[PDB]
Design a protein around this nucleic acid. Structure first.
Lengths: 226, 226, 224
DNA sequence: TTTT
DNA sequence: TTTT
DNA sequence: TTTT
């Protein structure tokens, strides 16, 4: 099985650990043994002019996934929204009401459907490939999320007198001479990881430590030696 | 405390990782320090003629648990159903409605009650030993579940041009020359593990990796060198 | 950021692993990198005269947290009750009704408000420091909980002819010549730990193993 | 409720 | 629904 | 709500 998935993750945090905006949207291609990805795309947001409320994220995700899908022709696309695995081309007012989610989630996806359902329909007509709202259950979505963490640190390294990056849930990053490695901290997930090439700038220090206000999320902090 | 528990787990998967049927029912005796089992029984189902909505699993579990219990005389039997630790001999329509569970769970256990409650009642009359629906809270149940994973791999090795075994949640297996070792991947459980003696066949290769559609579940895949 | 948090944890168990009463209330000061605490207070309960439904735990916690806060002057106090981070001084029946919690949770905090809300307002007036009900979301709270586990084992060491201590969720303890080290068993938490100096008595054996009735909780057993 |  |  |  070959799967393309996408996710947005990583946030700039202020000094009191409040998120300012998100950083990276990533689409990944995942193949057996489903532990990493060797082919991926990234789109960076502007975290300082980001609306957390919101929903530019899912639109960017489905677009980027389709873009990667046109190149690598996967069996299926996984979208990071836990709706029970329903096909996005089948999302109308009727099927959304039947979904087992909150009344808030329903009214929101009714709004999203107006743009996303035609998009998925067209792509399915072209290829037969479904875009499914699978979310939390998907390992490829989790690998995308890890890559969003990695690319968030890459963005931070490239844009830093100091920066705080809130990583996606329970993952760590490690800096090497010419690359950034990201790993899940949850061994129950079976060793999920990512690796991205980058030049590491000089004159800066970094630290990885727990977000004190959001348990199981780590902060990657960059400081200038200046 | 000496505990007999049982669980059914391990599934044959098709190539799209969809479960076909379950494989192993195991009953274990668990004693201090409650990390493994040295005395256990196994019953193999036919996964290609299995009704996944048949719920033959729990009936198989309580029978196998009672069978082992008669041999080792434990203090209590743990059944894998998270009902708050209620005694099975006390399960009637009255007590089931009072349970803090789903309405589907309630209707499932009203039917199950018809056979299981008399079974538990007789066993208690005979021995004084309760059968409790403790489920997720039980460490002996989790050890039973880990052994079901191991015996499923043993079954796979003994019955394979290729097989996909879907393991119980977040556990790994290790193949040695004359045995299979199973371990929880969750260190929060405090190091739960099992070990089963077996002959490992020639002319086959294997791999353990994440199920891409079900996060925190692993797949054990066997392939012929063919 | 400098944070004071508190928690009650650790229980005496009987031979069938049923909890009898809680042992330790701990308040900690937590600073960057937010993995441990070097400054903390402990208050021991009487586990053999404890009402597990009494909710003395939360009253003891806010008292001890405030006590430590007066000394180390933190930015904020974290209380171990998952109410969304609401300020305790802002807790009246009106704001409690709006809380996204169970009807039982609401009626418990209806009761608690009578004493704790004036206390928080009083403390805020004196220092400007908020007491927030953040609970599960807080790392300092988890560090307090780990310390409650450590102090429960110290209590076990100080009172042992034999004892079963049920530790807080998924943590381990290790006994060294002159100290007890406690660690989260969950690597997702990113390496939370604590360490307490104590004199370890002679003539004792101890063992740590899973509570067979409560998955992901460990038992500390000590014998003479 | 259980199951991957 | 998603986000730290 | 919290506790093993």
């Amino acid at each position: 099985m070959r799967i393309v998935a996408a996710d947005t993750g990583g946030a700039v945090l202020d000094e009191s650990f409040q998120p300012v905006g998100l950083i990276a949207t990533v689409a990944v291609l995942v193949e057996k043994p489903y532990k990493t990805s060797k082919r991926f795309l990234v789109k960076y947001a502007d975290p300082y002019n980001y609306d957390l409320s919101g929903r530019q994220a899912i639109r960017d995700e489905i677009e980027l996934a389709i873009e990667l899908a046109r190149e690598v022709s996967p069996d299926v696309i996984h979208l990071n929204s836990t709706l029970g695995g329903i096909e996005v081309r089948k999302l109308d007012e009727s099927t959304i009401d039947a979904l087992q989610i909150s009344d808030r989630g329903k009214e929101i996806w009714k709004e999203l459907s107006k743009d996303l359902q035609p998009l998925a329909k067209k792509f399915w007509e072209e290829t037969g490939i479904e875009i499914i709202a699978i979310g939390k259950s998907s390992v490829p979505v989790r690998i995308a999320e890890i890559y969003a963490g990695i690319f968030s640190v890459k963005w931070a390294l490239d844009n830093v007198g100091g920066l705080l990056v809130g990583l996606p849930r329970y993952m760590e990053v490690e800096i090497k001479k010419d690359k950034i490695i990201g790993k899940s901290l949850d061994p129950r997930e079976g060793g999920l990881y990512g690796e991205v090439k980058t030049e590491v700038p000089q004159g800066i220090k970094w630290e990885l430590y727990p977000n004190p206000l959001v348990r199981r999320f780590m902060v990657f902090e960059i400081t200038s030696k200046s």
